[model samples]
Target chain A: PTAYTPLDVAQAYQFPEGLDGQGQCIAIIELGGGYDEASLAQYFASLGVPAPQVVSVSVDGASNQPTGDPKGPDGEVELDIEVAGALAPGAKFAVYFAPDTTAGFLDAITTAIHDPTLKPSVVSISWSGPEDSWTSAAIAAMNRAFLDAAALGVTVLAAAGDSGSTGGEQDGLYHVHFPAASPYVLACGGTRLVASGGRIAQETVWNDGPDGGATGGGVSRIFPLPAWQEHANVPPSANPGASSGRGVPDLAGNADPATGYEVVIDGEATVIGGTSAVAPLFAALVARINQKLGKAVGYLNPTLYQLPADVFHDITEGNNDIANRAQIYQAGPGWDPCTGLGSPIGVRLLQALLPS
Target chain B: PTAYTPLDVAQAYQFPEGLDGQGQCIAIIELGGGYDEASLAQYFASLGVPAPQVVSVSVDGASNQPTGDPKGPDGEVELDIEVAGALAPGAKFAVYFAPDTTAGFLDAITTAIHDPTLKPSVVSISWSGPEDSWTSAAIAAMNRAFLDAAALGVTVLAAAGDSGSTGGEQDGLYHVHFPAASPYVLACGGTRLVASGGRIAQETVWNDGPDGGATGGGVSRIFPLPAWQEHANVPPSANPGASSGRGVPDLAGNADPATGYEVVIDGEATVIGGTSAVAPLFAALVARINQKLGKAVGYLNPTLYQLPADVFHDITEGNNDIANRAQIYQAGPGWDPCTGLGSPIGVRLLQALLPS
Candidate 1:
């Protein structure tokens, strides 16, 4: 009962008291099996909201090798769709099913972008492998896809990781998440949203703790600071995990499983978490904005850094440190990788996405 | 109005009328650019059905890759989602957006099959390349993934192809479609569902014409008939196209674009056809049956061939003419390669998948 809720963020951002997506569509790219229909319906009914529309489509893998698991079923698929669905109840949601193989993932993404029927204004991806792990051919193909997405005005979001500064599953510390590390995506980070009395109490840097795990924010070993992020005042230590030499986590939100959303699966309810939740939540929120604004919120990176006023809720606190040390990068007048111009504040995001 | 509709096939098969999937989830796999939202919304609204939930979770493809001048912006993608969405309006739809590259496609499918959270009971795949074009290792890997899906009890349906008995692109008039040709999936063939009133119509063999332009029905070059298909009385000529010696199209539906469905895409209503349309329609019907029957329709090959009674509407007419024309397996009193075990015969299929 004491956990952070959308009520707090909604109040803080002065979100339109009404549904932003009265009739908008968003796409959540989950590279695994799909949600449990009956359970999901029950969950929505409990929330007193009409269950959102959902669809699933399949794709191939990144390496074209259908056998290897590119994005684990439980890890990526769960986090992506569930969070997106939770945030945008009025919008249409889709889970593009694909094999875990890298090639399959590639096929799915490309297909969505090319699909003329399910025109999604907001696209959120909750899966990523190591940045360096992709072959040049694969990376080139991926980069082209994302770049095109950006150009077409579709906002793309990818989870940084749950390992914060460190690549997950590795023995060492400080490694960037792939795809998330790609400059073309709005590499989203994670946080443990703190709320009390229906208002945001305080949000510290996202630390999964030993029990909760880590967050996925750090420097990229592949990309450099995108032109738009240059003014965001990214500190040298902000991304200690940058093997790609680029900083990550343009933004963040609650992702700890303990503070995860309630999901219905196979007629059962369960609380889950991961970077997957963060990516789609943002996608859904954007979908609402797209609907309210009568257009897709395309390529948010450049525009977000240049917001007019009081748009972003600045976060001047916390860090996901390693070796018992806290890294620091306080919020300032404008953009910062720590919070990427801060979380949505007011309907400014929606308005900003509209024609100026 | 004279064209054959996918729905006619379902109705002839006695698909239970009524939208019980008010809250079911269906995931789709796509391998190209993202959908054009504004354009698609207008198209769906014109269909009289509640707009579907659409998610564009990018996997690995050029974003908005030109659906293009050839067919105009990825016609393949448009055709896949639009047809599927029209057939199952009440179900939630998810599109796994992946790059078109071989690796991307593999990852998308594998991920969908094993995805722990997005537990879709039925997975539909409408895309396919040449059967022998892929590396053996890659094919093997993808095949293993499909096998895993089967083990999980998820029903997967794939398009046999519009290329007819021959794969078309290949030199041998016997080439086949991939993934569908693989033993792990349920290769869906094309049929002509000629209807009259809102009631039953005539179901016949799906032919691309005598020159080999109809449905991709022959034998797979990579797979042999599993034990389940042995009792179906497959012709030896079916092996001409299969590298693996397995017959294609475990089942059939209405194809022949000329005798297709009436759909409004982007406010433009047109007659659409292709085996692609039939695959998802069949998958969704099966999903509904699973919902009604309360179980996964796993490995249907065996149950379909030897149903206790009138479980299927046998198509005792039509032919593909592989052997120097004249008197091929022309629909008869029993199973025919062109129509397989015929189309669904109402809730009887529910019996095949249900427990007494």
Candidate 2:
């Protein structure tokens, strides 16, 4: 299993030519991880690109506390930074470190969104639990924060999840990941990509089943369907007595660790994948978009849904059922819940988003 | 136990004020059932409304060959004319008689649509079979005819079904009735209405289980979702390996036999209800709309879905499973396949359609 360089992903997504995320800022939300700038700099040098400036902000008394486990939260922190940095080298990075608690999480998001000093154009979050895990109060508060971000002209991207339709729960019902399920945020899903000679040969829904991982996606049990997702053909919830609602992972990117991204964490080279990696990758795309369009691509989900079919690769195969784990959704011809609008065709997406 | 006069239905649906179906024609499609003008006149005379003029058109050499079974096709023909005629007494009627075969059925539709002489503005079809009963070629051909009707500014209405989700068959799969499943036709579903003092007090999905009847509505296995239905929240196919598609029953009306319509068939008074009853009931509403607007309400499904919630009394308290006989759909808040868009508020619908 060879790992793909971040450049490979940028190329496969067909990142808009001649845009380096200039004059843009990408804010990353992290919990319980620290990044060493020396290793990140080495990674960018290897990719033949300048490393973006990195700054960390503490939220709710939580600092950059690494548990020294590369396979844990530290990997998420490093992966978010490296993937975003490699794609948009000219953009600045602001990592907000917070405790892995609901209060800390909300505070971290609001701090980033309302930050008067940094003023980020795009924010990426790679942390989420199942919708059932959060209290109603927490859900509402966090969603309100995201709505504030939308009102403030900031684009928010969050990882859908990595536990397939069950959201890492075997509780006999389907669960969607929160934050990702927020209608105001761009829910980023995951896919597995195969490249030969720097060209994408194949791509599919990232499903490794129960032994490992699968892309998390399903109908939201909390939020109602948004106006933007009306024509997306989102299926009804798999939960009994559940009707249709908002669908998860409004869009997707490569996240299969079997064909994952290459990055450096705590002076060790490692391969990382999950829906977490996809969020930062998409955040970088937004950064590039802001640079190209000379303004923030704020609340982009509605605009993205309106684009023509050619703007997406349109993944039409695979299911995220995780081996008969839950009542599942299969990929279809258009806007399926499993992989959203498939993966983006970046240059065309830029053109559609900011048509001249 | 109680029969609803067509006047009762008009009041319950809040038929637009002060407009009759003057100068409008409703074409009824009949496949092997004869309507007696004397009986229809006697039925209308009992309601104190002048009987609408009745004309018969032959298609594919089929005539009004009634078996005199009021419980069979004759009952359907009588119910269609009585419900539609009772609501819009000033509208003329042209019943197209054809064989029960696919070719004859399609010919009847086209002949009504393309009739240069005596061009009708609305069509009422009380006949349909499960989609699986027809060949792909027939489906495509019939859909093309409905598309032609749309282009020619004709409003076509068809019964969703009366056999629950199993589609009148004891087969082990969910089925949707065809012609009704066509994206271009306005599919009419059913409801059980309890009107108190000339007001609809209670209405639910018309399901009486195995011994009785239920409304027919579900996802089509063939037709893709239409642009107008993007926000309608249609569910996926109950059949395995099927994806989401066009939803059936764009709107619905009263069709419960226990609270059915009063009509005369073969000189005998009879009570009838089914999705067959709803098609003609809505056809009358369309006739009245044409009369009110001074033009045809051509291809009305898209416009109907865009109306505000006040335009239809939303029904959310029933399922169409026929006592769990098949994979079923439950009525939800907005646009569940069963009882689609619920029953219309006629005056409000007209207002929404032709805003001043």
Candidate 3:
């Protein structure tokens, strides 16, 4: 799939009626780095918009000190903030950051979810690690935090891994899911999306492995497939070794590095990609829908999975299948491993989430 | 240890002693995220310094397009650029960025070393993975590239891992050495360098692990001790399983997140810490020496190791021990794992290099 511009992506998710995310607050979880107050001030100036009254609260290990070591996860933090800024232009952003440690990661997420002041309508987690058995407790803890978020009617979105099916260590075989597989979260997958004809043209699963890129999808040994996942009409999976129901991808967006987002990390201009883009993009989409409908899309899975088939732009191509096992699961008419719900189709979600 | 102020570090390093490193160039390697030109322009303008002309070159996996997925090793890229800019203010920055994959990491290094035009006298790397059998080949490839940098007479610096010894994953015992395990490059380590009386009050190893904070060090299972290592009276490592000899760190600086550096990532102020600080601090010291001696001190390890102990501060106290093991290795009368030869004592290294 070709990469689509943000505007093109906006066009593809044709909320023909545009109340476009007028008022909503979103919390962004950052692992490293922070914002540039002066540049943000200047950015607002250029837009002829009132400078956002950005408030940064330290979550977990995030001291909110705003400048320490710039070498750790600087790029990750930069992309998270920049993408959030682009999509939710008027929405307030609360950066919940953590030190680059397992503890920091857990603390930030839990802290963000529990913080009553921010009470963000949507939460975005852009960092991940392999789904080791040991991590389940932390994942569950964070997911429970998200469950509370669901109770509060907040949508929690997590970017599936960028390593595709092979996971970070490019050894072959389908890998495990991270927070994406957590029951309460929206597991945002990725697509090599291209836009033409004022809508999506080519859309396929992300597969950026050693030679064949990877897509973060497979069965989860840690989590059972949620009930909403079963109704998507997904066929019986061929992955018999899978301990859980077929994992991902429920939804996806352009995440190819070749057609990536231009982001600056510590003053350097770097073109970035990976499911990292989808996390914030989905968060913004949720914010937009909330703004338009005057309500939040709480517990999105059941509703999203139950939507009519035409509600989504089904993907039927591409495979990150490294060991030829991929042919067993190429993109198909409905939900597949590669392109999930195939990006937002006209923001029907907006109407779906609101009461008449 | 009490942290040094800008004035203190500058004074101790003998700033503006002779030259300004205006002509010599330094190449910085980043994993992901690019710099924003406009932000730099504005930042420099605000600081009243002439903005250095920044020329960026993408390596193998880093290029014009986004990687699609935003997560993965992009954080390292941000850290490298920010630290490089902070340390080498006026030096031209040529970011050698590639995908965070093993291949991409090595490719970026090789590209920087081989760039005839940039011909940078110094190169710095900040991120690192485990130093075990799994990553040996890739690590060796990258180290070989640094060796090529040595062949070309360029100084190469790499951060010792930040996990303080348990190797981040904490697999039983503390692991030693990182790329610092490589003989060709300087294993830039950390120190809680605090100053009073215009002299160091306590410049000890920095160990920030789960147990405590200290430096990372240990003997090698792979790297044969170099002849130059003997000049510092490095002890014959007692542990036969030692993977490194006279394991890091060759020098030290402040790397505490509590007493961290100032940086702007994505328009927000953020404080960060890690071994990432040492790499650029080492690079900038090289730049400063080159300026003072009117000659680039490429491959200073072989030469500097020969200097009299008086030329260095000789950190005699502090330990990088954590979890009952000295992962940071303690500082002693001479070169130790914690702070090798200590930090530069005056521009003595400049004089030693060029005979001023």
Model 1 CA lDDT for position A57? 63
Could you tell me the lDDT of residue A95 within candidate 2?
Answer: 89
C-alpha local distance difference test of each model: 0.63, 0.84, 0.64
Fnat per model, in the order shown: 0.00, 0.00, 0.00
- Superposed model 2: Cα runs more than 4 Å off: A325-327, B1-356
lDDT of 1 by residue, B191-215 (tens): 7664444333245566545443566
Provide DockQ values for all models, in the order shown: 0.00, 0.01, 0.01
Local accuracy of candidate 2 as per-residue lDDT tens digits, B1-356 = 46888888888899986776999999998888887777888898898988888888999999977766736767767778888898888898889999988889989999999888769999888778898788989998999999999999999999999988788766677888998899999999998875634455456778776558789989888888989998988877878987979998788888988888877788988787888888888888999999988889898888888889989978765677776423277776779888889999998889887857
Can you write out model 3's per-residue Cα lDDT over B116-191, one digit (the tens) per residue?
8887888887766556744757766877787788888789888776666555545565566566777788887676
Cα-based RMSD of the predictions, in order?
A: 29.6, 18.7, 24.7
Q: Estimate each model's TM-score.
A: 0.46, 0.51, 0.47
Query: Per-model i-RMS in Å?
Result: 34.5, 22.5, 29.8
As a whole number from 0 to 100, the lDDT of residue B204 in candidate 3 is 46
